[PDB]
Amino acid sequence: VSPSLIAKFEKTSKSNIEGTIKFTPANNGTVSVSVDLKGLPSDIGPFPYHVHEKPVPASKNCSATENHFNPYNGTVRAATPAAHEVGDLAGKHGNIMGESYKTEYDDSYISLNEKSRSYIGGLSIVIHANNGTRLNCANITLLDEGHGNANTT
Numbered sequence: 795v796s797p798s799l800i801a802k803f804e805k806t807s808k809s810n811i812e813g814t815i816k817f818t819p820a821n822n823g824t825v826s827v828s829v830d831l832k833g834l835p836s837d838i839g840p841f842p843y844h845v846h847e848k849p850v851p852a853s854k855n856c857s858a859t860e861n862h863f864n865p866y867n868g869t870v871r872a873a874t875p876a877a878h879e880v881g882d883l884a885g886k887h888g889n890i891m892g893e894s895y896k897t898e899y900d901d902s903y904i905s906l907n908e909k910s911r912s913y914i915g916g917l918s919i920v921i922h923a924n925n926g927t928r929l930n931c932a933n934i935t936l937l938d939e940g941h942g943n944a945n946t947t
């Protein structure tokens with residue numbers, strides 16, 4: 795079974811958005827997603843958020859994550875969840891909204907399996923203002939410090 799992942803958002807001069815998006819392997823071949831965010835800016839939401847294709851660099855410049863993770867060439871607007879880009883979490887599941895936002899859902903398209911074409915490990919998540927402006931972003935990293943079948947964490 796594939797390991798859990800997390801994206802940790804930190805507050806800076808650029809953004810007050812902080813919190814986490816957790817990705818945990820679940821039943822029925824899906825991934826459980828847990829969003830817990832605060833400090834979302836006044837009135838420029840709702841906030842689309844997506845898995846992007848490159849890491850956040852040390853500069854924390856969210857532009858450097860480049861485009862959406864879209865291995866199966868999906869579309870931004872769709873009539874069924876699977877037609878969306880794999881990385882388009884908000885399009886499938888709803889935009890972030892409010893000053894604080896907590897939600898849990900299953901996504902059946904992202905993968906925690908590094909041998910999968912839909913693997914999202916090592917990628918990033920960007921949160922946008924409604925007009926598309928990139929507000930904050932975080933790398934998707936390993937959640938637990940200890941792994942292996944003879945270990946504890």
Ligand SMILES: [Cu+2]
Pocket residue numbers: 842843844845846862920921922
């Ligand atoms: Cu995006």
